[PDB]
Design an enzyme around this catalytic site. Sequence first.
Site, PDB file in Angstrom:
ATOM      1  N   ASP A 105    -114.714  33.739  67.671  1.00  0.00           N
ATOM      2  CA  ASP A 105    -114.246  32.488  67.091  1.00  0.00           C
ATOM      3  C   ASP A 105    -114.557  32.429  65.602  1.00  0.00           C
ATOM      4  O   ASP A 105    -115.673  32.107  65.216  1.00  0.00           O
ATOM      5  CB  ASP A 105    -114.915  31.314  67.818  1.00  0.00           C
ATOM      6  CG  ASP A 105    -114.468  29.966  67.295  1.00  0.00           C
ATOM      7  OD1 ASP A 105    -113.484  29.924  66.535  1.00  0.00           O
ATOM      8  OD2 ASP A 105    -115.095  28.942  67.684  1.00  0.00           O
TER       9      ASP A 105
ATOM     10  N   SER B 222    -102.123  28.825  52.021  1.00  0.00           N
ATOM     11  CA  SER B 222    -100.817  29.433  52.173  1.00  0.00           C
ATOM     12  C   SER B 222     -99.881  28.932  51.077  1.00  0.00           C
ATOM     13  O   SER B 222     -99.988  27.801  50.626  1.00  0.00           O
ATOM     14  CB  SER B 222    -100.250  29.109  53.554  1.00  0.00           C
ATOM     15  OG  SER B 222     -98.909  29.529  53.708  1.00  0.00           O
TER      16      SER B 222
END
EC number: 3.4.23.22
Length: 330
Positions: free
Chosen positions: A35, A199
């Site tokens: 994770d 992004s």
Amino acid sequence: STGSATTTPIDSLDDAYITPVQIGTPAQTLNLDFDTGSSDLWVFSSETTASEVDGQTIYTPSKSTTAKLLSGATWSISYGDGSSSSGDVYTDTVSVGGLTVTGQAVESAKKVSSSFTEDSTIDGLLGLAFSTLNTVSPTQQKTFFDNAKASLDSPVFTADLGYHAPGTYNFGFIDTTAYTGSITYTAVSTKQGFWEWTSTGYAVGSGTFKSTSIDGIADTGTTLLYLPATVVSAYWAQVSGAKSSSSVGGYVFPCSATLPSFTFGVGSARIVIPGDYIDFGPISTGSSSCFGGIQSSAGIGINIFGDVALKAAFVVFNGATTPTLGFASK
């Protein structure tokens, strides 16, 4: 040193991925959910409340000759999906794919929430976010990666998650045969303890690319892709009959649909998520309403590039002095 381990989807939807991890002496192998959005290595154990164990493999520290109680240490964690767990702490030898860390903090669960109990395939979590998020008190502990880093050939790990197929976590090297083209690296902020990056935009299907900054985290422990409501609405508007359902808890779509791809930007590079990766199947057995793999982050407080996004790429988690993230197509 290096390590390399295969990671395997827990079910036919890729709801999560499990990776075998050796703990203790002799080794006790548990299948952990790696994770990159949390920083605790915790396991089902011989200390876990019996009614909360249902098929998981447990770590029994009393059977490990290298286990030592970390006196006074406790831990307690709550995840973004509302699940939680807590307990006490041992140090022990932990190996992943041939890479060994001695004195790793292994957090033994005394209590786990129902969603953990109900998932027989996940024996615990191995956190790979920054150690600043580790919940051990009163002395915060380091992640497996943080402990291994100085010994690694290069201070990196890579996630290569499969679509409906196994993939690989590598530690300490970049497998140049595992991706196509080049790896595009992008800046990371560690201020919130995550692999947080920005992004450069998105496209829906064969549509034009929208240049827009989308801050979010690379999180292997989250199944879906969570993005701003504007982006998510633009995606689902291209699927006839798709709608946001308050009762189901997100966007659903007719299972008869053919889903468009979704592209996200990494610098000037582009990662394409095929439409099929966005299908999470019937909302309930036999239903013709299917659950979408791109959902709104509104009310989460952060955008999350979860498995839906990451499995479309070869992803480098670069833990150099100034961390960065790399993405390649594959």
